[PDB]
């Protein structure tokens, strides 16, 4: 467990340094594999539909925002700090404001696993994959629990 905790933090350290490219790749992977998920993101849907040249920059911008939230929550959890405030307002905005089902959130987490296996093939081994999958399963269950309130 303590090994997995260190693997998660070290992995997110490397993701943080390349968050714009990785975040854009995660959003691209999610939207291509799940057009039903892209439909629930109106701004990205219209930029995709119209072949807008601004799409790449906005994918990098928002992809960094998504990864920054995951990185911060992981650092708070595995350091014994209070992450409840971030989990609640992230779940509030996505259930009430953005109206995003939990399954679409899983598509993002599944895309992050697939992107990291491609971007870090010699570091993202079985230990790193199992540790990140455990955190992502934990993150989804926490948001899902806040949904059921
Ligand atoms: C692990 C999954 C996800 C994470 C960590 C995440 C994180 C975030 C964060 C930190 C923000 C900015 C602050 C906020 O609005 O709360 C945001 C905004 C937003 N999210 Fe996500 N999100 C996830 C999944 C999704 C998915 C799958 C969709 C839609 C298909 C979505 C739709 C949106 C929208 C529409 C916004 C507003 C962006 C804007 O107004 O510029 N989220 N998300």
Author numbering: 1 to 149
From the paper:
From these remodeled backbones, we again performed sequence design with ProteinMPNN, with the heme-binding site kept fixed. We found that it closely agreed with the design model (0.66 Å Cα RMSD), including the regions remodeled with inpainting. Outside of the heme-binding site, the crystal structure confirms the structural changes introduced by inpainting: the C and E helices were elongated as designed and connected by a new loop (inset II); the loop connecting the E and F helices has a new conformation, and the F helix was straightened through the replacement of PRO88 with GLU89 (inset III). The Cα RMSD over the inpainted regions between the crystal structure and the design model is 0.88 Å, with the largest deviation being in the CD-loop region (1.51 Å).
Here, we show that the deep neural network ProteinMPNN, together with evolutionary and structural information, provides a route to increasing protein expression, stability, and function. Myoglobin binds heme to carry oxygen in mammalian muscle tissue, and has relevance in clinical applications as a biomarker, as a versatile platform for biocatalytic applications,18−20 and in food science as an ingredient in artificial meat products. Current efforts to create more stable variants of myoglobin have focused on the stabilization of the globin fold through stapling with cysteine-reactive noncanonical amino acids. The globin superfamily, of which myoglobin is a member, has a fold made up of eight alpha helical regions, with diversity in the termini and two loop regions flanking the heme-binding pocket27−29.
